[PDB]
Amino acid sequence: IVGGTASVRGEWPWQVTLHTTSPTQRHLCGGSIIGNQWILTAAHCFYGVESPKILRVYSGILNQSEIKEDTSFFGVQEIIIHDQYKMAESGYDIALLKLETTVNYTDSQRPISLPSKGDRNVIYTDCWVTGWGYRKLRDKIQNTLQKAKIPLVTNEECQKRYRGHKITHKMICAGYREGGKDACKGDSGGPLSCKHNEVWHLVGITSWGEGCAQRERPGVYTNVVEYVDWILEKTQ
Ligand SMILES: O=C(O)Cc1ccccc1OCc1cccc(-c2ccc3c(c2)CNCC3)c1
Secondary structure, eight states: OBSOEEOOTTSSTTEEEEEEESSSEEEEEEEEEEETTEEEEOGGGGTTOOSGGGEEEEOSOSBGGGOOTTOOOBOEEEEEEOTTOSOGGGSOOOEEEEESSOOOOOSSSOOOBOOOTTOTTOOOOOEEEEESOOSSTTOOOOSBOEEEEOOEEOHHHHHHHOTTSOOOTTEEEEOOTTOOOBOOTTOTTSEEEEEETTEEEEEEEEEEOSSSSOTTOOEEEEEGGGGHHHHHHHTO
């Protein structure tokens, strides 16, 4: 998170830290709790992941320093990548982690709803991007969970900044015209959560963009509402 501030415990309870344990154990990507044994993340996070054996999902984590050799975690039973996925910049950057056990919901770990059936025309004015990612292009993974309010930009406006990319209706962009606040390396997979009528919705999944928080270069996200049918087909 570029231009963000620290979160407090139980602020983003659907946020998870997916770790890899090969060749070293570290924060790989972010994710969202969308069900008792379901995590919604981005497919590109599993590039070079040979099997779910090396992964660990940590929920209820504020600082990465809280993760010790005795810290509880969830094993991943299955990694469901979108069948159409190839590269992040081209879309379908959506994956589902099916955990080995159910999540007991508390204040530090609860599920986030997907955009509602009938809220397609909603103008989201309170969107937030969260994660433990970099604060600049050549940085390191953060300790506390950063947050950033980012305005959504239209598909047409976003397509102007990305003349060399195909910005589809399965993508949503968020950024400030003069840069400053954005998600960077380590934030992918995580949520772009927008609050509407005091309910949080998982509106996007952190995906890609030219550099981190550059001017007139919005963050590109997976448009969750478009994939709700895929998610329901898989989580049933
Ligand atoms: O993809 C990750 O987060 C971490 C990761 C996992 C697996 C393989 C590669 C990899 O890192 C690639 C990498 C390198 C530098 C910056 C980014 C990055 C990430 C997100 C966003 C932006 C940029 C621009 N702003 C909008 C959001 C990604």
